[PDB]
Amino acid sequence: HLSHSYIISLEQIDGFAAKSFPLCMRQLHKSLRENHHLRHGGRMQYGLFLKGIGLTLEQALQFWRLEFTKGKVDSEKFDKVYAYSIRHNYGKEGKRTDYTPYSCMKVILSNPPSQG
Amino acid sequence: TGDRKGDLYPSSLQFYQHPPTENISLIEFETFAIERLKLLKAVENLGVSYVKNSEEYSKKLELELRKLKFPYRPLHEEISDDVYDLRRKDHISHFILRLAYCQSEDLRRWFIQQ
Amino acid sequence: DCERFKFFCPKCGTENIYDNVFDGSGLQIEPGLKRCSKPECDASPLDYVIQVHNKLLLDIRRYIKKYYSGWLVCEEKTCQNRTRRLPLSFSRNGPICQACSKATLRSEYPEKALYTQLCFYRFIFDWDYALEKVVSEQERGHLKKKLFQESENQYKKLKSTVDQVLSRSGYSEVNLSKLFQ
Amino acid sequence: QKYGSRTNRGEVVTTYGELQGTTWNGGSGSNTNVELFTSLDEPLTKMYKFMFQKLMDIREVVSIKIEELGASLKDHFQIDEFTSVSLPAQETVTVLGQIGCDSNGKLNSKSVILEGDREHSAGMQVPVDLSELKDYSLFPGQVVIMEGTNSTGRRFVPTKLYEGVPLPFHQPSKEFEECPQQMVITACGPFTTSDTITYDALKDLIDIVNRDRPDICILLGPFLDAKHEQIENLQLTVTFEDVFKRCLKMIIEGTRPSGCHLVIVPSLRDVHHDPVYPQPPFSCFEPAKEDKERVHFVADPCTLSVNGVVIGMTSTDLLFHMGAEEISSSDRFSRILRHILTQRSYYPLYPPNEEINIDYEALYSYTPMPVTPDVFIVPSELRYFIKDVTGCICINPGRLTKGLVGGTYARFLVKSGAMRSTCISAQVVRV
RNA sequence: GGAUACUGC
Ligand code: SF4
Ligand SMILES: [Mg+2]
């Protein structure tokens, strides 16, 4: 503990969800906080949106880790699986492209949601 | 060279190659560790605040080294006991901090920089 | 988790709890052993420093006795077996509790606890450390003058006792050869 | 008040050996040679770092104690093989172990367990059923060899309990054949009355020493009792070290006329000394140049050689500690003393009593009894006595002060090669 | 959400 010897914020995101978030993101956030888990489409959409608002790679990683850990899953499982997706949304791996946030046209014409 | 000294500390600057072999006290261990942590934190703060070639940087770093009693200036007199003590401090403290700053890559980088 | 130093005033008999070298803030800060905790009491514990020394030695004896009592408790919540006897049957983690035969016996008062208690008793009498770390700037200036030299000397003498005790503890020499190889 | 007006001054409360005159005289330590018994193991003569015991180290020390005593007993008894205590045994098997209590209370015949060593039993325990044993005497921490059967694999039933084997006595060299008989006065603390800090009993004893001029004076602690009512309630106006220094100065300077070798043994009740057993010698007092050769600051326990006579001594109240735990089938003190001698340790009780702090590495290194002592000084809160246990003269001189009233001391005469009658005479006398 | 591998039992 020698290194720790005396000699945008995640918390406000919820606040934003009250007013600024468009109804799509409001619904996604409500479901996420209700169940601490999102199917793939929701993960992609919400991750891209939180990238758009400005949540940095470290910030987004922390937020997703904290939110998913409550879903009764192993902590290491998150780094094993979802870390690559989170990195890719920010153009960190693979083709390494700064993927832009979904446009309303894409969201309307993107994968059609189903039950769940 | 009063009682238990030697040629173990010829020069002020050293590459910290040979680990210490002495038996020190727990109080000495803690004092040396904390003192060198203060020195390194002062180095980091002055590096952030000032340009390392600046005269303000040099003055403040000399003040900190004097306050914590670390070797910073040569002495063309001889190896005086007090000087020996200071050098011993430096040599042990460094390795103690090595033990403190080798667990994580981040920490390692920080240590190296300072 | 360390017990604080309890001293009963000889005059008024009120308990004084000491947890730091200095008490108060700003220019109203003075060493703890300068004035009694009872406003109506004018007795200065610094006057009865022989009694403070004796109480310190008695407390150190009490803590050493607690450590050497060697009380062990089972780590299992559903067993919590408490024994003085250390069994020779060991698992990889330590002594095996002979009540349930499935959990480890942990020391009720480990060596670290005693070491930290002695270090705390040294801390509550470390004038120089308190001045450098605990005390603020204006408070340090107010305390680094005369009118406190006698208190400083008495505090140094009291810290000498805890230092002497700690010098005899194996939890007081660090072999740097074993660390760096 | 009560002590100063006593009427039984000088009364001989107990006697043993050759009858002597009403007055005892010594050689003033003229032809006297006092040293620590030179055995294979080095003695405890300086402080050792303590307060750091690893449970593994305690396990190792206890296990090696059991193993070593069992090896000696196996060689002595020509036992073929030891068997694991825990394993079932339909036929009779010989098992080595140490006794203990299945609970935290005091041992009784229905709460006895035998714990084996690491070599033969992996440290496993087994309950013991003493229904088939006709005669026994067991205390916790006692290393025993038993023949028995374990039909259920869950309860060992001893049928024979092997007796203890004391160490051989010392064979003195002829260097001290021509030395005269030596007089030893032994006293144990407390030295002051419960309500005083003036050391009146100590002054009376010093007067007795100067009057009789003994060759050795063995003073056992406490010298500044921790249980003294003044000490506990913090009524002392001077530091503990100062009171102890005053007491030691009184003892040493007051004995100058007698020229008597002083042997000072610390006690666990010494409020000013390190609370650990084996206790290192006192080191806070530097005798003047004229008393350096006379004062011997020894450790607790101590094995002393006096012109070839081996005297064992301990300040610890061994008899009180073991009497509270010893269980027998049917003299109790003689049994406990024989147990101490046969276990070959100055503190064989495990777990110890609540009033003693034991560092087990130091216990292993400095509590083995080198030989069976010619005289064994064992002060106790129990009644004074002079007993002959297996040829060793065990002396309990009581304590110099018993509460508000004066206590007792002991005086004995020792000569190497006398008649085995190394103890010519011994007497417990009143102060 | 998908795709590519190959271990096990
Ligand atoms: S997808 Fe576009 S139009 Fe539909 S709710 Fe979200 S922001 Fe509004
Ligand atoms: Mg999935």
Ligand SMILES: [Zn+2]
């Ligand atoms: Zn008061």
Ligand SMILES: [Zn+2]
């Ligand atoms: Zn248990």
